Coordinates of C-alpha atoms (C1' of nucleotides) and ligand atoms in Angstrom, one line a residue:
Chain A
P1 CA 55.5 -31.7 -11.2
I2 CA 58.5 -33.4 -11.9
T3 CA 61.8 -33.0 -9.2
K4 CA 65.1 -32.8 -10.7
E5 CA 65.7 -36.0 -8.7
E6 CA 62.8 -37.7 -10.5
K7 CA 63.5 -36.8 -14.0
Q8 CA 67.5 -37.4 -13.7
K9 CA 66.8 -40.9 -13.1
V10 CA 64.8 -41.4 -16.6
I11 CA 68.0 -39.7 -18.3
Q12 CA 70.4 -42.1 -16.7
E13 CA 67.9 -44.8 -17.6
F14 CA 68.1 -44.1 -21.3
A15 CA 71.4 -42.2 -21.6
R16 CA 72.6 -43.6 -24.7
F17 CA 76.3 -43.6 -22.5
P18 CA 77.4 -42.2 -19.8
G19 CA 76.6 -38.6 -19.5
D20 CA 74.1 -38.3 -22.7
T21 CA 72.4 -35.3 -21.2
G22 CA 70.2 -35.4 -24.5
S23 CA 70.3 -38.0 -27.5
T24 CA 67.1 -38.9 -29.4
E25 CA 66.1 -41.7 -26.9
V26 CA 66.6 -39.1 -24.1
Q27 CA 64.3 -36.4 -25.7
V28 CA 61.4 -38.9 -26.3
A29 CA 62.0 -40.5 -22.8
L30 CA 61.8 -37.2 -20.9
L31 CA 58.9 -36.0 -23.4
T32 CA 56.9 -39.3 -22.8
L33 CA 57.3 -38.7 -19.1
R34 CA 55.7 -35.0 -19.1
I35 CA 53.0 -36.5 -21.5
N36 CA 51.7 -39.0 -19.0
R37 CA 52.1 -37.0 -16.4
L38 CA 50.3 -34.2 -18.0
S39 CA 47.6 -36.2 -19.5
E40 CA 46.7 -38.2 -16.0
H41 CA 46.3 -34.4 -15.1
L42 CA 43.8 -34.0 -17.6
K43 CA 41.7 -37.2 -16.7
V44 CA 41.0 -35.1 -13.5
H45 CA 40.7 -31.6 -14.8
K46 CA 39.0 -32.2 -18.0
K47 CA 38.4 -28.6 -18.1
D48 CA 42.3 -27.2 -18.3
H49 CA 41.5 -27.1 -22.1
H50 CA 44.5 -24.4 -22.6
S51 CA 46.7 -27.1 -21.0
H52 CA 45.5 -29.9 -23.3
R53 CA 47.1 -27.6 -26.2
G54 CA 50.6 -27.9 -24.8
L55 CA 49.9 -32.0 -24.8
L56 CA 49.2 -31.8 -28.3
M57 CA 52.7 -29.7 -28.6
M58 CA 54.3 -32.4 -26.8
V59 CA 52.6 -35.5 -28.2
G60 CA 53.5 -34.0 -31.7
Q61 CA 57.2 -33.2 -31.0
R62 CA 57.7 -36.8 -29.6
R63 CA 56.1 -38.2 -32.8
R64 CA 58.8 -36.5 -35.2
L65 CA 61.4 -37.4 -33.1
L66 CA 60.7 -40.9 -33.3
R67 CA 59.6 -40.1 -37.2
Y68 CA 63.4 -39.3 -37.3
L69 CA 64.9 -42.2 -35.4
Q70 CA 62.5 -44.4 -37.6
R71 CA 64.4 -43.5 -40.6
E72 CA 67.6 -43.0 -39.0
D73 CA 67.8 -46.4 -37.1
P74 CA 65.2 -48.7 -37.3
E75 CA 66.7 -50.7 -34.4
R76 CA 67.0 -48.2 -31.8
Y77 CA 63.2 -47.3 -32.8
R78 CA 61.9 -50.8 -31.8
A79 CA 63.8 -50.6 -28.7
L80 CA 63.2 -47.0 -27.6
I81 CA 59.5 -48.0 -28.2
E82 CA 58.9 -51.1 -26.5
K83 CA 61.2 -49.9 -23.8
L84 CA 58.6 -47.4 -22.9
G85 CA 55.4 -48.8 -24.5
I86 CA 54.1 -46.5 -27.3
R87 CA 52.5 -46.5 -30.6
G88 CA 48.9 -47.3 -29.8
Chain B
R1 CA 57.7 15.5 -5.3
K2 CA 55.6 15.8 -1.8
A3 CA 57.3 13.0 0.3
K4 CA 58.6 9.4 -1.1
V5 CA 58.0 6.8 1.3
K6 CA 60.8 4.6 -0.3
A7 CA 63.6 7.3 1.5
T8 CA 62.0 7.5 4.6
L9 CA 62.3 4.2 5.2
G10 CA 65.6 2.1 5.9
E11 CA 65.7 -1.4 4.4
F12 CA 63.0 -4.1 4.9
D13 CA 61.4 -7.1 3.6
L14 CA 58.3 -6.1 0.9
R15 CA 57.2 -10.3 1.3
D16 CA 56.7 -9.5 5.3
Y17 CA 53.0 -9.0 5.2
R18 CA 53.5 -8.8 9.1
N19 CA 55.3 -5.5 9.8
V20 CA 52.4 -3.6 10.1
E21 CA 54.9 -0.4 11.3
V22 CA 56.1 -0.9 7.9
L23 CA 53.1 -1.3 5.8
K24 CA 51.2 1.2 7.5
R25 CA 53.3 4.1 5.8
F26 CA 52.1 2.9 2.3
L27 CA 48.2 3.5 2.5
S28 CA 46.0 6.6 2.7
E29 CA 43.7 8.3 5.3
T30 CA 41.6 5.7 3.8
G31 CA 42.8 2.1 3.8
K32 CA 43.5 2.6 0.1
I33 CA 47.1 1.4 -1.1
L34 CA 49.4 4.6 -2.3
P35 CA 50.0 4.9 -5.9
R36 CA 53.1 4.3 -7.2
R37 CA 53.3 8.0 -7.5
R38 CA 53.9 8.3 -3.9
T39 CA 55.4 5.4 -2.8
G40 CA 58.4 5.6 -5.1
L41 CA 58.3 1.9 -5.3
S42 CA 60.0 -0.1 -8.3
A43 CA 57.5 -1.4 -11.0
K44 CA 58.4 -4.7 -9.5
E45 CA 58.3 -3.5 -6.1
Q46 CA 54.6 -2.1 -6.2
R47 CA 53.4 -5.8 -7.5
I48 CA 54.8 -7.0 -4.9
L49 CA 54.0 -4.5 -1.8
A50 CA 50.6 -4.9 -3.2
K51 CA 50.1 -8.3 -2.7
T52 CA 51.9 -8.3 0.8
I53 CA 49.3 -5.6 1.9
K54 CA 46.2 -7.7 0.8
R55 CA 47.8 -10.9 2.5
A56 CA 48.2 -8.7 5.7
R57 CA 44.8 -7.1 5.4
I58 CA 43.2 -10.4 5.3
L59 CA 45.1 -11.2 8.5
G60 CA 43.3 -8.3 10.4
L61 CA 46.5 -6.1 10.8
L62 CA 46.0 -3.6 7.7
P63 CA 42.5 -1.8 7.1
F64 CA 40.7 -2.5 3.9
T65 CA 39.2 1.0 4.3
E66 CA 38.8 3.9 6.9
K67 CA 36.9 6.9 6.8
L68 CA 37.9 10.3 5.9
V69 CA 38.6 12.8 8.9
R70 CA 38.4 16.2 8.1
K71 CA 41.5 17.2 9.6
Chain C
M1 CA 63.2 -21.2 -41.6
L2 CA 66.0 -20.5 -44.4
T3 CA 65.0 -22.1 -48.0
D4 CA 66.9 -20.4 -50.5
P5 CA 70.4 -19.6 -49.5
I6 CA 71.4 -18.1 -53.0
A7 CA 68.2 -16.0 -53.0
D8 CA 69.4 -15.1 -49.3
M9 CA 72.4 -14.2 -50.9
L10 CA 71.8 -11.9 -53.5
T11 CA 69.3 -10.3 -51.5
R12 CA 71.9 -9.5 -48.8
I13 CA 74.2 -7.9 -51.5
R14 CA 70.7 -6.0 -52.8
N15 CA 69.7 -4.7 -49.6
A16 CA 73.7 -3.9 -48.6
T17 CA 74.1 -1.5 -51.9
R18 CA 71.1 0.1 -51.5
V19 CA 72.3 1.9 -47.9
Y20 CA 75.7 2.1 -49.5
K21 CA 77.5 -0.4 -47.2
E22 CA 81.0 -0.6 -48.2
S23 CA 80.8 -4.4 -47.7
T24 CA 78.9 -7.3 -46.6
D25 CA 79.5 -11.0 -44.8
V26 CA 77.5 -13.8 -46.0
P27 CA 77.0 -17.2 -44.6
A28 CA 79.5 -19.1 -46.9
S29 CA 79.1 -22.4 -49.4
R30 CA 81.3 -23.6 -52.4
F31 CA 78.4 -22.7 -54.6
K32 CA 77.6 -19.2 -53.6
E33 CA 81.5 -18.4 -53.9
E34 CA 81.3 -19.6 -57.1
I35 CA 78.6 -16.9 -58.0
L36 CA 80.7 -14.2 -56.4
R37 CA 83.8 -15.3 -58.1
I38 CA 81.5 -14.8 -61.3
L39 CA 80.3 -11.5 -60.1
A40 CA 83.9 -10.2 -59.6
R41 CA 85.1 -10.7 -62.9
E42 CA 82.2 -9.1 -64.4
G43 CA 83.1 -5.9 -61.9
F44 CA 79.9 -6.0 -59.9
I45 CA 81.5 -6.2 -56.8
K46 CA 85.3 -5.0 -56.2
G47 CA 85.7 -9.1 -54.7
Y48 CA 85.2 -11.3 -52.1
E49 CA 87.4 -12.4 -49.4
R50 CA 86.9 -15.8 -47.4
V51 CA 86.6 -14.6 -43.5
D52 CA 85.5 -16.0 -40.2
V53 CA 82.5 -15.3 -37.7
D54 CA 82.8 -16.7 -34.3
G55 CA 84.6 -19.5 -36.2
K56 CA 81.7 -19.7 -38.9
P57 CA 82.8 -19.6 -42.6
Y58 CA 81.6 -16.5 -44.3
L59 CA 82.2 -14.7 -47.1
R60 CA 82.6 -10.9 -46.9
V61 CA 81.5 -9.4 -50.2
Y62 CA 83.0 -6.1 -51.2
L63 CA 80.5 -3.6 -52.9
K64 CA 81.6 -1.1 -56.0
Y65 CA 79.6 2.1 -56.4
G66 CA 79.6 4.8 -59.0
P67 CA 80.9 8.4 -58.6
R68 CA 79.5 10.9 -56.0
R69 CA 76.9 12.9 -57.8
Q70 CA 76.2 16.6 -57.6
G71 CA 72.6 17.8 -57.5
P72 CA 70.5 17.6 -54.3
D73 CA 71.0 13.8 -54.1
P74 CA 74.5 12.7 -54.2
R75 CA 74.2 9.2 -53.5
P76 CA 76.3 7.3 -56.4
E77 CA 74.9 5.2 -59.2
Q78 CA 74.5 1.7 -58.5
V79 CA 76.9 -0.7 -60.3
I80 CA 74.8 -3.5 -59.4
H81 CA 71.4 -1.6 -60.4
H82 CA 69.2 -4.8 -60.5
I83 CA 70.2 -8.2 -59.0
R84 CA 67.4 -11.0 -59.4
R85 CA 67.1 -14.6 -58.7
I86 CA 65.5 -16.4 -61.6
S87 CA 65.2 -20.4 -60.8
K88 CA 64.0 -20.5 -57.2
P89 CA 62.9 -23.9 -55.3
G90 CA 59.5 -24.6 -55.9
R91 CA 59.9 -23.6 -59.3
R92 CA 63.1 -24.7 -61.2
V93 CA 64.2 -23.2 -64.1
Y94 CA 66.1 -25.1 -66.7
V95 CA 66.8 -23.8 -70.0
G96 CA 68.7 -25.4 -73.1
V97 CA 71.6 -23.2 -74.9
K98 CA 69.1 -21.9 -77.9
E99 CA 67.2 -20.6 -75.0
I100 CA 69.6 -19.1 -72.8
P101 CA 68.8 -15.3 -72.8
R102 CA 70.2 -12.1 -73.3
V103 CA 70.2 -9.6 -70.4
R104 CA 69.8 -6.0 -71.3
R105 CA 70.8 -6.1 -74.7
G106 CA 74.2 -7.6 -73.8
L107 CA 74.8 -5.1 -71.2
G108 CA 73.6 -7.4 -68.0
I109 CA 74.1 -11.0 -66.7
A110 CA 72.3 -14.1 -66.7
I111 CA 74.2 -16.5 -64.3
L112 CA 74.1 -20.2 -65.2
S113 CA 74.7 -23.2 -63.2
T114 CA 75.8 -26.2 -65.7
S115 CA 77.2 -29.6 -65.7
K116 CA 80.3 -27.3 -66.9
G117 CA 80.5 -25.0 -64.4
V118 CA 78.8 -21.7 -63.1
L119 CA 78.7 -19.8 -66.2
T120 CA 77.8 -16.4 -67.6
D121 CA 75.3 -16.7 -70.4
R122 CA 78.1 -16.0 -73.0
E123 CA 80.2 -18.3 -71.2
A124 CA 78.1 -20.9 -71.5
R125 CA 76.8 -20.4 -75.0
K126 CA 80.4 -20.5 -75.9
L127 CA 80.7 -23.9 -74.5
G128 CA 77.6 -24.8 -76.2
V129 CA 75.7 -25.9 -72.9
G130 CA 73.3 -24.7 -70.7
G131 CA 71.7 -25.7 -67.3
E132 CA 70.0 -24.0 -64.7
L133 CA 69.1 -20.5 -64.9
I134 CA 70.2 -18.9 -61.2
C135 CA 69.8 -15.2 -61.2
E136 CA 70.1 -12.0 -63.8
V137 CA 72.3 -8.8 -63.2
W138 CA 72.9 -5.2 -64.3
Chain D
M1 CA 58.1 -31.7 0.4
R2 CA 57.6 -28.1 0.9
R3 CA 57.6 -25.3 3.5
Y4 CA 55.0 -23.2 4.9
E5 CA 53.8 -20.5 7.2
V6 CA 51.3 -20.9 9.6
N7 CA 48.7 -18.1 10.6
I8 CA 46.7 -18.7 13.4
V9 CA 44.6 -16.0 14.8
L10 CA 42.6 -16.6 18.1
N11 CA 40.0 -15.1 20.0
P12 CA 42.1 -12.8 23.0
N13 CA 40.1 -14.0 25.7
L14 CA 40.9 -17.4 26.6
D15 CA 42.3 -17.9 30.0
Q16 CA 45.8 -19.5 30.1
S17 CA 44.4 -23.2 30.7
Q18 CA 41.7 -22.5 27.4
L19 CA 44.6 -21.1 25.4
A20 CA 46.9 -23.9 26.4
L21 CA 44.4 -26.5 24.8
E22 CA 44.1 -24.7 21.7
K23 CA 48.1 -24.5 21.4
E24 CA 48.0 -28.3 22.0
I25 CA 45.0 -29.4 19.4
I26 CA 47.0 -27.3 16.7
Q27 CA 50.3 -28.6 17.3
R28 CA 48.2 -32.3 17.3
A29 CA 46.7 -31.3 13.9
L30 CA 50.2 -30.4 12.8
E31 CA 51.7 -33.2 14.1
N32 CA 48.9 -35.1 12.3
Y33 CA 49.2 -34.2 8.7
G34 CA 52.9 -34.9 8.6
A35 CA 53.7 -31.3 9.4
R36 CA 57.3 -31.2 10.8
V37 CA 57.6 -27.8 12.8
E38 CA 61.0 -25.8 12.1
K39 CA 60.0 -22.8 14.3
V40 CA 57.3 -20.5 16.1
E41 CA 56.3 -17.2 17.0
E42 CA 54.0 -16.3 19.4
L43 CA 53.3 -12.6 19.0
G44 CA 50.8 -12.9 21.6
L45 CA 48.0 -10.4 20.7
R46 CA 47.7 -7.0 18.4
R47 CA 44.8 -4.5 18.0
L48 CA 42.9 -5.3 14.8
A49 CA 42.2 -3.0 11.9
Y50 CA 38.6 -4.3 12.0
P51 CA 36.2 -6.2 14.5
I52 CA 36.8 -9.7 13.4
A53 CA 34.2 -12.1 14.9
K54 CA 33.3 -8.8 16.8
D55 CA 35.9 -8.3 18.6
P56 CA 38.6 -5.6 18.1
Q57 CA 41.8 -7.8 19.3
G58 CA 43.2 -11.0 18.0
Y59 CA 45.5 -13.5 19.4
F60 CA 48.1 -14.4 17.1
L61 CA 50.4 -17.5 16.0
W62 CA 52.9 -17.9 13.4
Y63 CA 54.8 -21.4 12.6
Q64 CA 57.3 -22.2 10.2
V65 CA 56.3 -25.7 9.1
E66 CA 57.3 -28.8 6.8
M67 CA 54.3 -30.3 5.5
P68 CA 54.4 -32.5 2.6
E69 CA 52.6 -30.5 0.0
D70 CA 49.1 -32.1 -1.3
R71 CA 47.7 -32.1 2.5
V72 CA 48.2 -28.3 3.1
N73 CA 44.5 -27.9 2.1
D74 CA 43.6 -30.6 4.6
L75 CA 45.4 -29.3 7.4
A76 CA 44.1 -25.8 7.1
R77 CA 39.8 -26.6 7.1
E78 CA 41.2 -28.9 9.9
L79 CA 42.8 -26.1 11.6
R80 CA 39.8 -24.4 11.3
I81 CA 36.9 -26.2 12.5
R82 CA 37.9 -25.3 16.2
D83 CA 35.3 -22.6 17.0
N84 CA 37.8 -20.5 18.9
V85 CA 40.2 -20.2 15.7
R86 CA 38.8 -17.0 14.2
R87 CA 41.3 -17.5 11.3
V88 CA 43.9 -19.7 9.8
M89 CA 46.1 -18.8 6.3
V90 CA 49.0 -21.1 5.5
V91 CA 51.2 -19.4 3.0
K92 CA 54.4 -20.9 1.3
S93 CA 57.7 -19.5 2.5
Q94 CA 59.6 -17.3 0.2
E95 CA 62.9 -15.3 0.2
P96 CA 62.4 -11.5 1.2
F97 CA 62.8 -8.9 -1.3
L98 CA 64.7 -6.0 0.3
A99 CA 64.0 -2.2 -0.6
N100 CA 65.4 1.1 0.1
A101 CA 66.2 4.4 -1.1
Chain E
rC1 C1' 10.8 9.0 1.1
rG2 C1' 12.0 8.3 -3.9
rG3 C1' 12.4 10.3 -8.6
rU4 C1' 13.1 13.9 -13.5
rG5 C1' 14.4 19.1 -17.6
rA6 C1' 9.9 19.4 -14.6
rA7 C1' 6.7 15.6 -13.2
rA8 C1' 3.8 11.7 -12.1
rU9 C1' 3.5 6.1 -11.5
rG10 C1' 5.6 3.9 -6.8
rC11 C1' 6.6 3.6 -1.7
rG12 C1' 5.0 5.4 3.6
rC13 C1' 1.1 6.3 9.8
rA14 C1' 0.4 -2.6 9.1
rG15 C1' 5.4 3.7 10.8
rA16 C1' 8.3 4.1 5.0
rU17 C1' 13.4 7.3 4.2
rA18 C1' 17.9 8.7 7.1
rC19 C1' 20.4 6.1 12.0
rC20 C1' 22.5 1.7 15.1
rG21 C1' 23.0 -3.2 16.1
rG22 C1' 22.0 -8.5 14.4
rG23 C1' 20.9 -12.2 10.6
rA24 C1' 20.4 -14.5 5.6
rG25 C1' 21.7 -14.5 0.7
rG26 C1' 23.7 -14.2 -4.2
rA27 C1' 26.7 -11.8 -7.3
rA28 C1' 30.9 -9.0 -8.4
rC29 C1' 36.3 -7.7 -6.6
rG30 C1' 37.5 -0.7 -4.7
rC31 C1' 42.7 1.2 -3.8
rC32 C1' 47.4 -1.3 -6.1
rG33 C1' 46.1 -0.6 -11.7
rA34 C1' 49.4 1.5 -16.0
rU35 C1' 49.2 4.8 -21.8
rG36 C1' 51.5 -2.2 -17.4
rG37 C1' 51.6 -8.2 -17.6
rC38 C1' 50.5 -13.2 -19.5
rG39 C1' 47.8 -16.2 -23.7
rA40 C1' 47.1 -19.3 -30.5
rA41 C1' 43.0 -16.9 -30.5
rG42 C1' 38.0 -16.2 -27.6
rG43 C1' 40.0 -14.2 -23.4
rC44 C1' 42.4 -13.8 -18.0
rA45 C1' 42.6 -8.9 -12.1
rG46 C1' 40.4 -9.8 -4.1
rC47 C1' 43.6 -13.8 -1.1
rC48 C1' 45.4 -18.8 -0.4
rA49 C1' 47.2 -23.8 -1.4
rC50 C1' 46.9 -28.0 -4.8
rC51 C1' 47.3 -29.6 -9.7
rU52 C1' 48.8 -27.7 -15.0
rG53 C1' 50.6 -25.1 -20.2
rG54 C1' 53.3 -21.5 -22.8
rU55 C1' 57.4 -18.7 -22.1
rC56 C1' 62.5 -15.8 -21.2
rC57 C1' 67.7 -15.5 -19.7
rA58 C1' 72.5 -16.8 -18.4
rC59 C1' 76.2 -21.7 -19.6
rC60 C1' 77.8 -23.2 -24.6
rC61 C1' 77.3 -29.4 -21.6
rG62 C1' 73.9 -33.2 -25.1
rU63 C1' 71.7 -35.1 -29.9
rG64 C1' 73.6 -34.2 -35.3
rA65 C1' 69.2 -31.2 -40.3
rC66 C1' 65.6 -34.5 -36.2
rG67 C1' 63.6 -28.6 -39.9
rC68 C1' 59.2 -25.0 -42.1
rU69 C1' 54.1 -24.9 -43.9
rG70 C1' 50.1 -27.3 -44.0
rA71 C1' 43.7 -29.5 -48.7
rG72 C1' 40.5 -32.8 -45.4
rG73 C1' 40.6 -34.3 -40.4
rC74 C1' 40.6 -33.4 -34.9
rG75 C1' 40.4 -30.0 -30.7
rC76 C1' 39.7 -24.7 -28.6
rG77 C1' 35.9 -20.5 -29.7
rA78 C1' 33.2 -13.5 -26.5
rA79 C1' 27.8 -12.6 -26.3
rA80 C1' 23.2 -14.3 -27.0
rG81 C1' 20.5 -18.6 -27.8
rC82 C1' 18.9 -24.3 -26.5
rG83 C1' 18.0 -29.1 -23.3
rU84 C1' 18.1 -31.3 -17.8
rG85 C1' 19.0 -29.9 -12.7
rG86 C1' 20.5 -26.4 -9.0
rG87 C1' 20.7 -21.1 -7.7
rG88 C1' 18.6 -15.5 -8.2
rA89 C1' 21.0 -10.1 -4.4
rG90 C1' 21.8 -6.1 -8.3
rC91 C1' 20.7 -5.8 -13.4
rA92 C1' 17.3 -6.6 -17.1
rA93 C1' 14.7 -8.5 -23.7
rA94 C1' 9.6 -8.7 -23.8
rC95 C1' 5.7 -7.5 -21.0
rC96 C1' 2.9 -3.6 -17.2
rG97 C1' 2.3 1.3 -15.4
rG98 C1' 4.0 6.9 -15.2
rA99 C1' 5.6 10.7 -18.1
rU100 C1' 7.2 13.7 -22.6
rU101 C1' 5.3 14.5 -27.8
rA102 C1' 1.8 17.0 -33.4
rG103 C1' 1.4 11.2 -32.5
rA104 C1' 5.7 7.8 -29.2
rU105 C1' 3.5 3.0 -30.1
rA106 C1' 11.0 5.2 -28.4
rC107 C1' 14.6 8.3 -25.8
rC108 C1' 13.2 9.7 -19.5
rC109 C1' 11.0 7.5 -14.4
rG110 C1' 8.7 3.3 -11.1
rG111 C1' 8.3 -2.2 -11.5
rG112 C1' 9.1 -6.9 -14.1
rU113 C1' 10.0 -12.4 -16.7
rA114 C1' 13.3 -15.0 -19.7
rG115 C1' 18.3 -14.1 -18.9
rU116 C1' 22.6 -12.8 -16.4
rC117 C1' 25.6 -17.2 -11.9
rC118 C1' 26.8 -23.0 -10.9
rA119 C1' 27.3 -28.0 -13.2
rC120 C1' 26.4 -31.3 -17.5
rG121 C1' 25.3 -31.7 -22.8
rC122 C1' 24.5 -28.5 -27.0
rC123 C1' 25.1 -24.2 -30.2
rC124 C1' 30.0 -22.4 -33.3
rU125 C1' 28.6 -17.3 -34.9
rA126 C1' 31.2 -11.7 -34.6
rA127 C1' 34.0 -5.0 -36.5
rA128 C1' 36.1 -13.4 -33.6
rC129 C1' 40.3 -6.4 -35.9
rG130 C1' 46.5 -5.0 -36.0
rA131 C1' 40.0 -5.1 -40.4
rU132 C1' 47.6 -7.0 -41.8
rG133 C1' 48.7 -15.9 -42.2
rC134 C1' 53.1 -18.8 -40.6
rG135 C1' 58.4 -19.7 -40.6
rC136 C1' 63.2 -17.3 -41.6
rG137 C1' 67.4 -14.3 -43.4
rC138 C1' 68.4 -8.9 -44.5
rU139 C1' 67.8 -3.4 -44.3
rA140 C1' 70.1 4.1 -39.8
rG141 C1' 69.2 5.8 -35.7
rG142 C1' 66.2 8.1 -31.4
rU143 C1' 63.3 7.5 -27.1
rC144 C1' 59.6 5.9 -23.2
rU145 C1' 58.3 1.5 -20.7
rC146 C1' 58.0 -4.4 -18.7
rU147 C1' 61.0 -8.2 -17.8
rG148 C1' 66.1 -11.2 -17.5
rG149 C1' 72.1 -11.4 -17.9
rG150 C1' 77.3 -8.6 -17.2
rU151 C1' 84.0 -6.9 -16.8
rC152 C1' 75.7 -3.9 -14.4
rU153 C1' 78.6 5.2 -16.4
rC154 C1' 77.1 1.8 -20.0
rC155 C1' 76.9 -3.2 -22.5
rU156 C1' 74.0 -7.5 -24.0
rG157 C1' 68.6 -10.6 -24.5
rG158 C1' 63.3 -10.9 -24.9
rG159 C1' 58.3 -7.9 -24.8
rG160 C1' 55.6 -3.3 -25.3
rG161 C1' 54.7 1.9 -27.4
rC162 C1' 55.7 6.9 -29.7
rC163 C1' 59.0 9.1 -33.6
rG164 C1' 62.1 8.6 -37.8
rA165 C1' 66.9 6.3 -42.4
rA166 C1' 66.6 4.0 -46.8
rG167 C1' 62.6 2.0 -49.1
rC168 C1' 57.4 1.1 -50.1
Ligands
MG201 MG1 64.3 -28.6 -73.5
MG202 MG1 21.8 -2.3 8.5
MG203 MG1 16.9 -15.3 -1.1
MG204 MG1 50.1 -11.2 -27.1
MG205 MG1 40.6 -8.5 -27.5
MG206 MG1 78.1 -27.8 -27.5
MG207 MG1 77.7 -37.5 -35.0
MG208 MG1 79.3 -35.2 -32.5
MG209 MG1 55.5 -26.3 -35.6
MG210 MG1 51.5 -27.0 -38.5
MG211 MG1 30.1 -20.4 -27.6
MG212 MG1 26.2 -17.4 -22.1
MG213 MG1 19.6 -22.0 -19.6
MG214 MG1 15.9 -23.5 -15.2
MG215 MG1 4.8 2.4 -22.2
MG216 MG1 13.0 0.4 -16.6
MG217 MG1 14.9 -2.3 -11.5
MG218 MG1 70.5 -16.7 -28.2
MG219 MG1 67.2 -3.9 -20.8
MG220 MG1 62.2 -3.7 -29.0
MG221 MG1 55.9 5.9 -37.5
MG222 MG1 61.4 8.7 -46.7

RNA sequence: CGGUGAAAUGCGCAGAUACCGGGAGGAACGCCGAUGGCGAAGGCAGCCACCUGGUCCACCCGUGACGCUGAGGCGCGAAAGCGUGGGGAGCAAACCGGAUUAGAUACCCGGGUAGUCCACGCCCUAAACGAUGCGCGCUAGGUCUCUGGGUCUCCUGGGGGCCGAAGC
């Protein structure tokens, strides 16, 4: 899985200010995690079709948040993407 | 209400798959896991018990099946 | 999700009345409160009062009914017999002045949103202006 | 990492100097696979409900260990090679569910 | 012996059936098991560990409308069925034989190949059904049940059923 300790260090990494338990950047971050983490599982388990379902949902969600941020503050969008290497 | 095995017992661990002397009492004259009707167990309890007995049988302690002796 | 909150308001009142509720609360909005202000004047409701549900702005609409009746069903005549949303999102309905309609031979209301306010058909036709045709009542 | 409960059943007929050597080889597999032992209960032997491996008794080991997760499966089929082991069952530790009336 | 309404085909003195012990093999998991649970659907029940999705409740801490729907596209998709390879206990289309019957050329009985099983790639249909698209707000209650929380007589969420106000 992801242990609390692991995920917390992600949070603190992207946190827009001390204590931000969940801004946009943070949500994208934590979500980006869960995706790579799950995608990797799916390279091994190509038959877990059911879990793939949740992956589309996670992915699509990640897009809508970014989509929002692109419109909102296009700079924090560049930042957040580069700082995570996405859109490809 | 013939006899409820919830009452004839103190408190015990339902996840304890080694406590034969307890578990023994939730089976029939055959190895069969008693119905919740005779066990008096909760809805949640019975599912837990259910797994514990299965675990314990596989360990060799409780029987899968018996043979009915006309008593 | 919620898409029309004026529909939602009207429909809140409709459903309320059919059960002879004495009153129902409706999430507030400058606009809705205008429509209510109108409904008040014209006597379809006893009035609305602005209240607070869990520190959330709301509008207590206080409904009005007929008198009890004899016969084997005594549930009062409605006062708001029929309330109905006309311009809706995903088909707006704008009316020029010489196209503002008459509701029930003069007996009902059409509530209009104009650049001069939220007006009744008569109020608007008097100020010589038209606008969005919100709902009809009677 | 996670904590478990290693069960092992051995045949009852091992003389002391033979049973002692399966207890060590167990303890060296444990040793080997990161499995830090927290506590042990040798219940000795009970009479089974059915003939495991043709004999009506079985010798019982228990071990509340602390493996790292992803190696538990190795440990087991590594424990289970030893011929005098009749059954191994490792199991995740969980808080007791209490019931009465 | 088996087998049916009765019976034959079949199997049996190369010793069957019934009984005890040994071994191999495949496929499905009795009791729990519910009128229960989970899943978007198709669907999912021995046990264990690993990897993994959805989801509910409490706290009311963070973001600050970021939301809903969705032509085409893309993925999932029972059973049967196709290609290659492996597997084959039981079952069993076709086919073989026994009976029945006016005639069976079916329903009944004895066999039996595909198939049913695993992997990989296809097929993409269904009474794929709640024959009820998704999302949100509003409109009496009673009762049974699975599952959270509380100051747990009762209160308060989320499911699953039955009965019913208004209405339809
Ligand atoms: Mg015009
Ligand atoms: Mg035999
Ligand atoms: Mg064979
Ligand atoms: Mg469901
Ligand atoms: Mg179904
Ligand atoms: Mg807050
Ligand atoms: Mg702000
Ligand atoms: Mg703020
Ligand atoms: Mg969506
Ligand atoms: Mg959609
Ligand atoms: Mg298919
Ligand atoms: Mg198939
Ligand atoms: Mg094939
Ligand atoms: Mg083949
Ligand atoms: Mg024939
Ligand atoms: Mg046949
Ligand atoms: Mg056959
Ligand atoms: Mg809530
Ligand atoms: Mg409850
Ligand atoms: Mg309910
Ligand atoms: Mg009904
Ligand atoms: Mg009625």
